[PDB]
């Protein structure tokens, strides 16, 4: 799970799968939700 | 320390330094200052003159002279005369001087009230249990020939930079770094300090180092694990703040200064690992064999054997032949080092001018 | 937010803003630059 | 969610449904549902006109039912307009409602007091009032009628007091009608209200549409002067070896505190420093079998 820090502007959560690995994008609006 | 251990308000505390010259306005309090400013015979500033008049015109009940071994100096002697103090307590760690004026402190301050037994404090864990040692570094053939056909001032530089001392210091640094020890390497010669640090890739601190660089190097020494060895000149001998170290390597020294020797030993005597069972600090005095460094080294060690420390000689180090890199092992490299050491010695008219 | 306190009734509003509110130096250890780390904190 | 928030939402819904028309109710319910709303979002939700929302926003701002935020943002196309954000300041709104109803009941009590004053007189010709105090100074020599100062016409009697009970009846017909309001403020006064603002209202908004031109992220400016838990399931056989691993660390602790070889002994005499049972257990297993048979966009990232 790649997560963004609070200092960055855009909030987005990257998901990495296992066996080509599947990658998903999860962007959010509020910092408490992240 | 005053504002921490005792119930003294900061409004009762005053500091007489260059930056701070404001005194306490109460009827009684604490003032802390330096020997140099109080005993300054030079033309001092108006604010410092006013503060000195305040100190002289006030009858003080107590004076605490830290590092009282420098009181017998020329005008550091006069600080007991310029200040009217009822009680005078001189706190020290190194109560020796190479001249006889250290016997004048009973006349200046008073009788020697208490001696601390350093073995009694070491066996109770109050101070570290140092393993004092003296490594005998033999001088090479081409270096010792130049040592005898030279004056004493150049001889002093020449017996420091013998390649066997480089190899011994490098091996001790490697061995005590593998053990995970914070190491301070003391050498009063600035050129020798720089050469050893450049050869061994370690930071060096001396008089001309900027203060912020000194703080950065000390913070890296305290916390960064890749920096476990610091090379310090006579800056570390005097009162500067240092991180805790457990190993010391004394490359060079200021003649037969027993005070400097005991001050250097005092920088490894307050280690945090004293509570650990079997912990021992280490003190190495790397000396050149068959030189005048032996004489001065014995003179410096004469005070510590009075405290009880035993300096075990080390004429052999196990791992000399099997260390990976030896500084100045090849004869041509030693010859290059030798020749490098020998190479050392009207508002309108104002614009036209 | 505060005139209710004058008349006794409790105001749910905290009083607003309107009432009461406001180097680099030289380095001598040039042989090991990039090895030492910065420590602005303990 | 929070019950006090539900109570203040019902209070705000009740005061607009009673003393205000339907469009005001629609605007306030839009703000109460979607806690953060801009002008374009309000127009898109309500299908309302710019001139239609004028008096509505003016009246809800005059009563502090809707607070406005003047923040402008930077969209990627850089065609930014100074959008106004309509939201609600809950303690300010309930304080405004409380003050308004208190002033209404005080004004009604004052009107009851004024109607309790005697009838007085009024001149139908010059349309001027005259109190009962100044009527007696204007009566005729016959002591029968009160004559006007200007028209010299007999004063007719007003109705100050005939409808006074009606005002009290109006008072009664207000109070039950305001009864759910006062009952709601009991739990409000007995509880704590968190003072919300624009930054607080962004924690509870409801998205009006997917593609919103107004950006809800706050943009600060400079110069304005207004842990994780892990468990280990062990079979208790490897754990002993783990203790052996700890023993290895203990052995390292013996090497860290080890006395150097030149310190423990004298270095004087040395030279100077310078430059197969597997088949057996298989047969036992076969014998076990035999015996048993017989017996039976990219940015910075921080990993958290
Ligand atoms: Zn009239």
Report the 3 state secondary structure along B240-261. Answer: CCCCCCCEEEECCCCCCCHHHH
- C-alpha closest to that of B183 among B203, B210, B163, B153: B203
* Backbone φ and ψ of A23, nearest 5°: -120, 135
* Cβ atoms within 10 Å of D151's Cβ, excluding its own: 13
> B316, D273: Cβ pair inside 8 Å?
yes
Q: D12, D102, D195, D197: which to substitute to probe chain C, counting the most C Cβ within 10 Å? A: D195
Place of tokens 């300096």: B311
- C-alpha closest to that of D44 among D217, D215, D211, D216: D211
DSSP B180: T
Distance from CA of D149 to the nearest CA of C (A): 45
- C-alpha closest to that of D137 among D146, D129, D128: D146
- Residue D144 CA to ligand 1 centre (angstroms): 17
- Residue B180 CA to ligand 1 centre (angstroms): 113
Cα separation, D94 vs C11, in Å, equals: 9
Name A11's Cβ contacts closer than 8 Å, sequence gap at least 6. Answer: A4, A27, A28, A29, A30, A31, A34
Cα separation, B316 vs D263, in Å, equals: 11
Distance from CA of B247 to the nearest CA of D (A): 12
> D268, B280: Cβ pair inside 8 Å?
no
- C-alpha closest to that of D4 among D192, D200, D143: D192
State the count of interchain CB pairs (< 8 A) between A and D.
29
Q: Give how far Cα B217 sits from Cα of B212, B251, D59, Å.
A: 9, 20, 67
Q: B318, B327, B328, B337: which to substitute to probe chain D, counting the most D Cβ within 10 Å? A: B318
- Residue B162 CA to ligand 1 centre (angstroms): 130
Using DSSP's 3-state secondary structure scheme, residue B85 falls into strand
Cα separation, D38 vs D31, in Å, equals: 9
- Residue D154 CA to ligand 1 centre (angstroms): 8
Q: Which of residues 10-39 of C touch D (CB under 8 A)?
A: 10-14
Cα separation, D262 vs D265, in Å, equals: 6
Contact status of A7 with chain D (Cβ, < 8 Å): yes
Q: Which of residues 242-271 of D touch B (CB under 8 A)?
A: 255-263, 267-268, 270-271
**DSSP string of D67-98, one letter each residue:** EEE------TT-----PPEEE--HHHHHHHHH
H helices of chain C, in order, are: 3-6
Q: Using CB atoms, pick whichever of C4, C9, C12 lies closest to residue D193.
A: C12
Q: How far is CA C31 from the centre of its chain?
A: 39
> D216, A7: Cβ pair inside 8 Å?
no
- C-alpha closest to that of D116 among D172, D163, D170: D163
Closest chain A residue to the Cα of D200, Cα to Cα: A30
Q: Give how far Cα D294 sits from Cα of D280, D288, D289, Å.
A: 21, 10, 9
Beta-strand relationship, D156-157 and D121-123: antiparallel
SS3 content of chain B, % helix, strand, coil (to 5): 45, 15, 40
> For residues B216 and B203, is the Cβ–Cβ distance under 8 A?
no
Provide the CB-side half-sphere exposure for D13 (13 A, CA): 10
Name B161's Cβ contacts closer than 8 Å, sequence gap at least 6. Answer: B143, B192, B195, B337, B341
Which positions in chain D touch C14 (Cβ < 8 Å)? 91, 195
Cα separation, B95 vs B262, in Å, equals: 10
Plot region of D171 (φ>0 → left; ψ -120 to 50 → alpha; else → beta): alpha
Token readout for B193 is 């300090």
Using CB atoms, which chains have 3+ pairs under 8 A with D? A, B, C
Name B75's Cβ contacts closer than 8 Å, sequence gap at least 6. Answer: B39, B41
> A4, D299: Cβ pair inside 8 Å?
yes
Place of tokens 């239609």: D52
Token readout for B94 is 């190194």
Q: How far is CA C35 from the centre of its chain?
A: 33
> C13, D92: Cβ pair inside 8 Å?
yes
Structure resolution, Å: 3.1
Sign for the pseudo-dihedral over CA of D73, D76, D80, D83: negative
> B212, C25: Cβ pair inside 8 Å?
yes
Q: Using CB atoms, pick whichever of C4, C9, C14 lies closest to residue D195.
A: C14
Helix (H) / strand (E) element for D157: namely: strand D156-157
- C-alpha closest to that of C35 among D79, B249, B225: B225
> For residues B251 and B185, is the Cβ–Cβ distance under 8 A?
yes
> A10, D304: Cβ pair inside 8 Å?
no
Q: Using CB atoms, pick whichever of C26, C31, C39 lies closest to residue B220.
A: C39
State the count of interchain CB pairs (< 8 A) between C and D.
27
Contact status of C39 with chain B (Cβ, < 8 Å): yes
Contact C/D (≥3 CB pairs under 8 Å): yes
> A4, D202: Cβ pair inside 8 Å?
no
Plot region of C34 (φ>0 → left; ψ -120 to 50 → alpha; else → beta): left
Token readout for B153 is 């001032």
**DSSP string of B286-333, one letter each residue:** EEETTSHHHHHHHHHHHHHHHHT---EEE---TTSTT-S--TT-SHHH
> B216, C35: Cβ pair inside 8 Å?
no
State the count of interchain CB pairs (< 8 A) between B and C.
42
- C-alpha closest to that of B310 among B301, B300, B319, B297: B301
> C25, B216: Cβ pair inside 8 Å?
no
Q: How far is CA D155 from the centre of its chain?
A: 60
Q: Give how far Cα D83 sits from Cα of B211, D23, D71, D142, D203, Å.
A: 54, 21, 7, 75, 20
**Count of all residues that appear for chain D in the document:** 304
Sign for the pseudo-dihedral over CA of C23, C28, C30, C34: negative
**Count of all residues that appear for chain C in the document:** 42
- C-alpha closest to that of D32 among D95, D84, D93, D82: D93
Q: D88, D97, D193, D224: which to substitute to probe chain C, counting the most C Cβ within 10 Å? A: D193
Cα separation, D144 vs D129, in Å, equals: 19
- As a whole number of Å, the end-to-end CA separation of chain A is 12
| Extended beta strands in chain B, E state | 13-16, 30-33, 60-66, 85-91, 130-137, 183-186, 204-205, 229-232, 247-250, 281-288, 312-314
Which residues of B touch chain D, with CB atoms under 8 Å apart?
131, 133, 135-138, 163-164, 167-168, 175, 179-180, 276, 278-280, 282, 312-318, 320, 326, 329
H helices of D63-209, in order, are: 90-116, 132-136, 164-175, 179-189, 198-201
| Rounded CA Rg of chain A | 11
């Amino acid at each position: 799970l790649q997560a963004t820090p609070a200092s960055s502007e855009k909030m987005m959560l990257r998901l990495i799968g296992k066996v080509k690995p599947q990658r998903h994008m999860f962007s959010f609006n509020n910092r408490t939700v992240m | 320390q005053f504002l921490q251990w005792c119930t003294l308000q900061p409004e009762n505390c005053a500091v007489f330094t260059s930056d701070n010259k404001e005194m306490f306005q109460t009827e009684s309090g604490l003032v802390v200052s330096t020997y140099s400013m109080v005993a300054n015979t030079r033309n001092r500033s108006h604010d410092s003159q006013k503060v000195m008049d305040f100190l002289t015109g006030r009858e003080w009940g107590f004076i605490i002279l830290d590092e009282v071994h420098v009181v017998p100096a020329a005008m550091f002697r006069r600080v007991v005369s310029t200040i009217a103090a009822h009680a005078k307590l001189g706190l020290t760690a190194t109560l020796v001087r190479e001249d006889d004026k250290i016997g004048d402190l009973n006349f200046l301050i008073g009788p020697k009230l208490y001696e601390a037994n350093w073995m009694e404090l070491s066996q109770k864990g109050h101070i570290a249990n140092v393993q004092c040692a003296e490594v005998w570094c033999p001088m090479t053939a081409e270096f010792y020939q130049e040592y005898l056909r030279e004056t004493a001032r150049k001889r002093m530089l020449l017996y420091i930079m013998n390649p066997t001392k480089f190899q011994a210091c490098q091996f001790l640094i490697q061995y005590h770094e593998r053990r995970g020890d914070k190491i301070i390497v003391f050498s009063d010669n600035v050129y020798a300090l720089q050469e050893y640090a450049l050869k061994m890739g370690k930071p060096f601190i001396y008089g001309s180092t900027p203060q912020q660089e000194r703080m950065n190097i000390l913070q890296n020494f305290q916390y960064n694990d890749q920096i476990n060895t610091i090379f310090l000149s006579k800056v570390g001998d005097t009162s500067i703040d240092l991180p805790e170290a457990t190993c010391l390597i004394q490359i060079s020294s200021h003649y037969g200064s027993r005070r400097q020797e005991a001050q250097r030993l005092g920088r490894i005597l307050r280690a945090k690992r004293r509570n650990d069972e079997g912990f021992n600090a280490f003190f190495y005095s790397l000396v050149s064999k068959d030189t005048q460094e032996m004489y001065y080294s014995t003179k410096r060690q004469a005070f510590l054997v009075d405290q009880g420390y035993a300096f075990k000689v080390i004429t052999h180090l196990h791992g000399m032949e099997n260390i990976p890199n030896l500084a100045y092992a090849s004869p041509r490299e030693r010859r290059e080092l030798l020749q490098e050491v020998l190479l050392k010695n009207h508002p309108l008219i104002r614009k036209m001018y | 937010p505060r005139k209710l306190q004058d008349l006794g009734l409790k105001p749910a509003s905290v009083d607003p803003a309107t009432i009461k509110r406001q180097r680099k130096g030289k380095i001598t250890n040039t042989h090991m630059t990039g090895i030492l780390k910065d420590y602005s904190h303990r | 969610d929070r019950p006090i928030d539900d109570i203040v939402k019902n209070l705000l819904k009740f005061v607009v449904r009673g003393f205000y028309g339907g469009s005001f109710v629609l605007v306030l319910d839009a703000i109460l549902f979607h806690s953060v709303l801009a002008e374009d979002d309000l127009k898109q939700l309500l299908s309302i006109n710019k001139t239609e929302l004028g008096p509505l926003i003016a009246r809800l701002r005059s009563d502090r039912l809707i607070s406005i935020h003047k923040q402008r943002e930077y969209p990627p196309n850089s065609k930014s307009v100074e959008r106004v954000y309509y939201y609600v300041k809950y303690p300010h709104a309930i304080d405004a409602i409380k003050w308004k109803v208190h002033q209404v009941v005080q004004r009604l009590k004052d009107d009851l007091d004024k109607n309790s004053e005697p009838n007085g007189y009024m001149c139908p010709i010059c349309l001027t009032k005259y109190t009962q105090l100044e009527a007696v100074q204007l009566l005729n020599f016959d002591r029968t009628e009160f004559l006007c100062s200007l028209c010299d016409e007999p004063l007719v009697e007003d109705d100050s007091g005939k409808k006074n009970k009606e005002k009290q009846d109006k008072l009664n017909r207000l109070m039950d009608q305001i009864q759910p309001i006062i009952d709601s403020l009991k739990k409000i006064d007995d509880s704590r209200i968190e003072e919300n603002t624009f930054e607080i209202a962004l924690a509870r908004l409801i998205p009006p549409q997917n593609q919103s031109h107004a950006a809800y992220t706050y943009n600060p400016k400079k110069g304005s002067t207004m842990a994780t838990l892990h468990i280990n399931i062990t079979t208790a056989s490897d754990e002993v070896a783990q203790r052996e691993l700890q023993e290895r660390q203990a052995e390292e602790k013996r090497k860290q505190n080890a006395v150097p070889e030149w310190h423990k002994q004298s270095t004087i005499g040395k030279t100077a420093l310078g430059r197969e049972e597997r088949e057996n257990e298989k047969t036992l297993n076969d014998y076990y079998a035999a015996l048993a048979k017989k017996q039976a966009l990219e940015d910075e990232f921080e990993d958290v």
